[PDB]
Amino acid sequence: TGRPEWIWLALGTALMGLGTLYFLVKGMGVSDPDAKKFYAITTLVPAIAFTMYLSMLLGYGLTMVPFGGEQNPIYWARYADWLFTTPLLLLDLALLVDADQGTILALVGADGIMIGTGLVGALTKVYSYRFVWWAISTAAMLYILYVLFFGVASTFKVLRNVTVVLWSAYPVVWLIGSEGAGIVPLNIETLLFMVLDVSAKVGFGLILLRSRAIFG
Amino acid sequence: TGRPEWIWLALGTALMGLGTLYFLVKGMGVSDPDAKKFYAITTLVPAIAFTMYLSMLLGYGLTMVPFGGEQNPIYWARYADWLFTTPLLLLDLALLVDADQGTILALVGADGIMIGTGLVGALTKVYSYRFVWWAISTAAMLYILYVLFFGVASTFKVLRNVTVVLWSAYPVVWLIGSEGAGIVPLNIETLLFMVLDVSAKVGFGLILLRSRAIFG
Amino acid sequence: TGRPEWIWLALGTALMGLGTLYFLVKGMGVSDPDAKKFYAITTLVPAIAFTMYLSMLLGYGLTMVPFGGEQNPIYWARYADWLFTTPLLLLDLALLVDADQGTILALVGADGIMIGTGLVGALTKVYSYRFVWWAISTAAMLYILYVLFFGVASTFKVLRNVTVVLWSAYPVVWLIGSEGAGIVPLNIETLLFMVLDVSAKVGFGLILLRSRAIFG
Numbered sequence: 021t022g023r024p025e026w027i028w029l030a031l032g033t034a035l036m037g038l039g040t041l042y043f044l045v046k047g048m049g050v051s052d053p054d055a056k057k058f059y060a061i062t063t064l065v066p067a068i069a070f071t072m073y074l075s076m077l078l079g080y081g082l083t084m085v086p087f088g089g090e091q092n093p094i095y096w097a098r099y100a101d102w103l104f105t106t107p108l109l110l111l112d113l114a115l116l117v118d119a120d121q122g123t124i125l126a127l128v129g130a131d132g133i134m135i136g137t138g139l140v141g142a143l144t145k146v147y148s149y150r151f152v153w154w155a156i157s158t159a160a161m162l163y164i165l166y167v168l169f170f171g172v173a174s175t176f177k178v179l180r181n182v183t184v185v186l187w188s189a190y191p192v193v194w195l196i197g198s199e200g201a202g203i204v205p206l207n208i209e210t211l212l213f214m215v216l217d218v219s220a221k222v223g224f225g226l227i228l229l230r231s232r233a234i235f236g
Numbered sequence: 237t238g239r240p241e242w243i244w245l246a247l248g249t250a251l252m253g254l255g256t257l258y259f260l261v262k263g264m265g266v267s268d269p270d271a272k273k274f275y276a277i278t279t280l281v282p283a284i285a286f287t288m289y290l291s292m293l294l295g296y297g298l299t300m301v302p303f304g305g306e307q308n309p310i311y312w313a314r315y316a317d318w319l320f321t322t323p324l325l326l327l328d329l330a331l332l333v334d335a336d337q338g339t340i341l342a343l344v345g346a347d348g349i350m351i352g353t354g355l356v357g358a359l360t361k362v363y364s365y366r367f368v369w370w371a372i373s374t375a376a377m378l379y380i381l382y383v384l385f386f387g388v389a390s391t392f393k394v395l396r397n398v399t400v401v402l403w404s405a406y407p408v409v410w411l412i413g414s415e416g417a418g419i420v421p422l423n424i425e426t427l428l429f430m431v432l433d434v435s436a437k438v439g440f441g442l443i444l445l446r447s448r449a450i451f452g
Numbered sequence: 453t454g455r456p457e458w459i460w461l462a463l464g465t466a467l468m469g470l471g472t473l474y475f476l477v478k479g480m481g482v483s484d485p486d487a488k489k490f491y492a493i494t495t496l497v498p499a500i501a502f503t504m505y506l507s508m509l510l511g512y513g514l515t516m517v518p519f520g521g522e523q524n525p526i527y528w529a530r531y532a533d534w535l536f537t538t539p540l541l542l543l544d545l546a547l548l549v550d551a552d553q554g555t556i557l558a559l560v561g562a563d564g565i566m567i568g569t570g571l572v573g574a575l576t577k578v579y580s581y582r583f584v585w586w587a588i589s590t591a592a593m594l595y596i597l598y599v600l601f602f603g604v605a606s607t608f609k610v611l612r613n614v615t616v617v618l619w620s621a622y623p624v625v626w627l628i629g630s631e632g633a634g635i636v637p638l639n640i641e642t643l644l645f646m647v648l649d650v651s652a653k654v655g656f657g658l659i660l661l662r663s664r665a666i667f668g
């Protein structure tokens with residue numbers, strides 16, 4: 021359609037949907053409560069993302085934000101997506117290592133500030149302030165990674181580093197993309213987030229559910 | 237007032253308020269933690285709905301959505317209502333049959349997508365796409381009913397079928413009402429949702445709390 | 453800047469940030485899961501508030517609401533703040549006295565209606581109706597205080613009365629401030645909420661975390 025990035029949105033929609041179907045079928049039959057837990061969590065994340073990519077695709081999860089003298093398309097549904105899926109992803113790690121509740125709360129808590137401040141950064145009309153919110157969000161992401169390292173083992177370790185490399189990519193792509201300094205066109209900005217999202221929402225899950233660590 | 241549907245909104249407000257008072261008084265004295273749980277859950281649901289019908293009544297939870305060439309009044313507060321009460325209703329069943337946590341999460345998870353996609357459907361300006369969101373929401377509702385059947389007993393069974401007949405009514409009324417194909421005037425569309433809501437928010441609760449199944 | 457209340461917003465930002473840092477450092481080393489719980493909860497609350505005061509300061513969490521024939525600046529981010537921090541504050545008391553789950557739910561449930569109805573009151577364009585929402589919110593606050601009194605001991609008692617005096621201040625300041633009857637200028641309205649917020653978000657926490665009651 022009229023938006024260059026549409027094919028990336030259409031591809032992410034498709035891959036999230038297929039990933040959703042795949043885990044739904046994969047999950048059928050699980051009777052082990054613990055495994056049930058990782059299956060629910062892991063199936064729900066691309067289901068949520070599927071509906072969010074579709075709203076972006078259909079143009080509903082998109083808005084225009086004025087700044088830098090320009091009218092700027094902002095996909096707010098990306099953040100609405102992360103707002104619900106990043107805490108579940110952290111839930112999978114939590115459950116893996118059996119984190120106690122104060123840690124889980126701090127994690128989930130830091131994550132909501134991460135995405136909420138980043139959504140504020142996204143919608144802020146004062147150009148310079150957007151980077152203030154990028155900074156606080158990035159600070160929160162770093163606390164989350166800090167806990168992950170200093171706050172099953174082998175699978176945990178695997179998903180941990182996947183997480184590091186994947187989650188730390190989101191900050192840069194924000195910065196260089198159209199929501200930030202405006203280094204890379206929106207069209208390529210959407211492509212990168214799609215590739216991260218699918219790796220984080222489907223790839224991560226394939227890696228976790230194919231492991232016996234999820235089993236009591 | 238100026239809106240035909242006002243008397244239905246005023247009636248739902250009144251019935252939810254009275255239902256709220258009734259359970260609040262009913263609940264006083266409960267010392268059994270488990271029963272306490274069903275009382276809180278069941279009292280909270282019409283309290284939330286009371287405030288939401290009032291915002292609709294007062295006109296705050298109402299907006300106009302353009303599509304089909306027309307400006308269309310949409311009661312978004314209906315969805316804000318279901319967003320918080322449908323998961324608690326599912327909580328009551330969950331607690332009844334002592335569902336494990338992976339099931340509860342999948343249930344609560346599918347329910348949030350159900351109402352969120354249906355709210356997107358409600359606010360979408362592209363006529364044809366609204367039905368796409370109706371379809372995904374309906375798909376999620378069907379997963380929720382699927383779990384309910386394939387995922388205390390007697391009371392469970394009773395509330396289960398009440399749930400089936402009541403929840404499956406919401407899809408049709410969306411379709412034929414003004415938010416969809418536009419078969420039934422808004423005025424009658426509001427009347428039907430009010431009747432469902434009160435049966436689902438008060439009737440359901442009367443049935444559950446009058447049972448000893450809620451007792452350890 | 454152009455807004456008189458800015459210095460109060462800047463002061464609250466600063467005090468919440470410093471309070472956040474202070475507990476973060478204070479919390480380092482805690483290994484006792486229960487204590488971990490009060491530390492997470494208590495550190496998260498001014499972190500959330502920090503980001504919300506900053507959005508108010510920067511002007512992002514501010515909007516204009518028409519009523520009384522005038523265009524009226526409303527800091528909606530104040531409510532977005534309370535929406536997440538008041539339930540955690542109640543969590544600290546809950547955990548103190550080891551409230552059972554039906555109580556916690558009723559508490560958290562009444563609190564969300566409290567702030568949500570008060571946010572509706574804040575954004576309502578019909579002058580007289582704002583006070584209807586003030587009334588329902590106040591009713592919910594009273595239920596929350598009722599439970600607190602009729603629904604560790606010594607610390608509980610201390611935080612309980614702090615809570616009473618602090619939380620009951622918010623209703624009056626709404627009433628006399630610019631969001632209500634318009635008795636006190638916005639500039640002083642913001643000052644009072646800042647003083648309450650910092651006492652409720654930092655002061656309360658200093659009092660709780662300096663106690664051994666948080667320890668198993």
Ligand SMILES: *C\C=C(C)/C=C/C=C(C)/C=C/C1=C(C)CCCC1(C)C
Pocket residue numbers: 101102105106109134135138139154157158161186187188190191194217220221
């Ligand atoms: C959809 C799955 C995941 C794993 C998404 C993770 C996204 C983030 C870690 C985003 C972080 C951001 C930061 C650190 C600062 C700028 C705003 C963002 C929200 C993009």
Ligand SMILES: *C\C=C(C)/C=C/C=C(C)/C=C/C1=C(C)CCCC1(C)C
Pocket residue numbers: 317318321322325350351354355370373374377402403404406407410433436437
């Ligand atoms: C207030 C109480 C209940 C039991 C409400 C239940 C509502 C639904 C099951 C709504 C479902 C919808 C579907 C399936 C698709 C169109 C949009 C709706 C949200 C109306």
Ligand SMILES: *C\C=C(C)/C=C/C=C(C)/C=C/C1=C(C)CCCC1(C)C
Pocket residue numbers: 533534537538541566567570571586589590593618619620622623626649652653
């Ligand atoms: C930030 C910390 C706390 C302890 C804030 C508490 C705020 C309230 C108790 C607010 C209550 C309100 C009432 C009772 C009615 C009018 C609207 C308010 C939301 C201000």
